[PDB]
Structure formats: structure tokens, C-alpha cells
């Protein structure tokens, strides 16, 4: 291609086959100013690609956070736990940013209690389901280097 335009500050999406999307991210230790900065970059970024959630992972960085807003703004989940999982399931068609092009359906919990940490290091526990509750685990999912061609659903 002839012409370019380089972005900066937000941050690049790693795509499929770079080795970072596999490798299990490591929690975050560290609850500074740079935990901070990186979150708003991640948030600049994912509005950029207009994706619903990002992870470290995606940007490089096999920690275990990601954002994500499904609707009601920006939410950013450092080191979360899913705590439990309803057994109640749903199919529905997921794409990734890491994948571009290709959409697959995924068979999700419909509901789940998670925990995590924001910016400060707080812990947050909530329930979420539906829509919120597929994003939530799909990015969780990075976290453990499991993407959404290891769950196409039969």
C-alpha cells in the first residue's frame, strides 16, 4: 500500500500468530501511575479499532488485564477471578480484533460472579450476564491465552 498513517500514544493490536496472545498472562503487582496510564491508553485504543474489549495481551503485555465497555462506558478489570459460572449456557457469534475478519460462534455461561481490582488495587466483586457477561469472559480468556478458535461451537 502507497499511503500510511501512523498512529501514536493509543497502542498497535497484536494479530493472531504473534506468541504473546498464547503465553499466560502474570498479574499485576504494581498500582501506580503507569497501571493508570496504561489503562487509558488501552481504553483510547480499543474505541480506536471500535472493539467492546481489549487485553493486555492484544497490546503486548501478558499481564492479567483488560478493558472492556459493553454499553455503559469504560470498565477496567485488573487481575480478575471468575468466581463462579451459571450452567446455563447461549451460542452467539464473537470477532476478535486479533483476528480480523473472521467471526465464530461461542458457547458462553450466561451468568457469572467475578472479582477484581481497578486502578487502585480495590477489589470490586459483581454478577454480571448476558452480553456483559460473554465480553467479560472472552477477555478473560486472553488472559489465559485461550482465544475464540479454541471455542467454535459444534
Known sequence: ????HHHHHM??????????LRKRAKPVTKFDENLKKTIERMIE??????????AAPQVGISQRFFVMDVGNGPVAVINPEILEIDPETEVAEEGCLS????????E???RIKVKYQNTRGEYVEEELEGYA?????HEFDHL????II???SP
Open 1 to 4: 500500500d502507497k499511503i500510511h
Open 11 to 20: 497502542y498497535r493490536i497484536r494479530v493472531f500468530g504473534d506468541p504473546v
Open 45 to 54: 485504543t480499543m474505541y480506536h479499532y471500535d472493539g467492546v474489549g481489549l
Open 99 to 106: 483476528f480480523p475478519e473472521i467471526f465464530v460462534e461461542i
Open 108 to 110: 458462553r455461561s450466561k
Open 133 to 137: 457477561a460473554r465480553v467479560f469472559q
Open 144 to 147: 489465559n491465552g485461550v482465544l
Open 150 to 152: 479454541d471455542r467454535i
